[PDB]
Symmetry: C2
Subunit: 171 residues, 2 copies
């Protein structure tokens, strides 16, 4: 199974230093789907204030983060988040015109729970800003990925997942 130490090995690939205490604060998400290396996300929250947040994400090789959106909370538009690939490769899919031939697909057994198909390919240095309240999902290439998130305040509990099988306590 996935461990926090294994996630930290990817931070180290990217040259990103966490203290021992911080490694213990890494979050492992499997979304209750029982297939963590295929569908899951791992992250470390640097900071989350009433105005801004940053996280360092790790995806293992071929791992997919399932489709979700960040809805308005407290009268704003929803979380806007900027994703910057630090290591590896990530295929990000966002609302927009469907890419006719995508480079990767979500897991076949869950595919009906993915609805957006506009492809953004990110290698290290690549960056993209996902607009508030828009559906998105992403999958790492065969070396995995480390991705920085820079955003407005995060409230994971309000995130809305396309797959109805994914519950609030899963985020």
């Amino acid at each position: 199974g996935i461990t926090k130490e294994e996630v930290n090995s990817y931070y180290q690939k990217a040259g990103i230093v966490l203290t021992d205490e911080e490694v213990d604060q890494i979050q492992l998400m499997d979304y209750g789907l029982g297939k963590e290396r295929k569908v899951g996300l791992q992250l470390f929250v640097y900071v989350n204030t009433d105005r801004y947040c940053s996280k360092e994400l790790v995806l293992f090789p071929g791992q997919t983060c399932p489709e979700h959106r960040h809805p308005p909370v407290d009268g704003q538009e929803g979380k806007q988040e900027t994703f910057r690939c630090r290591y590896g490769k990530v295929y990000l899919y966002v609302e927009g015109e469907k890419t006719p031939l995508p480079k990767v697909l979500p897991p076949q057994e869950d595919r009906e729970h993915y609805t957006v198909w506009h492809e953004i390919e990110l290698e290290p240095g690549g960056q993209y800003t996902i607009p508030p309240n828009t559906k998105h999902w992403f999958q790492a290439g065969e070396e995995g990925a480390v991705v920085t998130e820079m955003s407005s305040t995060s409230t994971d509990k309000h995130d809305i997942f396309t797959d109805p099988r994914i519950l609030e306590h899963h985020h």
Copy 2:
């Protein structure tokens, strides 16, 4: 003289990848003081939206960023900013009780224009959040430093420098 390529060499020390286009967007600040390697700052802005901002800062060995504060703009408290050392060492001085014996001092010829003395020493992985509208300055150790800034929206032009000799067009 300092060049953008030289600044990028420090990003590379920290494992941080910028594209060629991004290297060209690095900002070099000397604050009009004519001693860039002693008093100055270099940075790359990843993103700056109406809600959040992130920058990657470089300080050369022994270089000091002069004292300033981020005042309220638009009815909020002022920019709150989280500083995380990625490489090297930085000595950060913030409002608070004066550290009786600091590890470093600002340039002797400008020292009267530094007024806060509460010392925070950061090595890689170290992080500190500078509260809104509070004076702060910082200086790298003998290997220099790379420091990530994560903050609310940045508006450099409204920053207030303690040294009256530093002008608006210098930031």
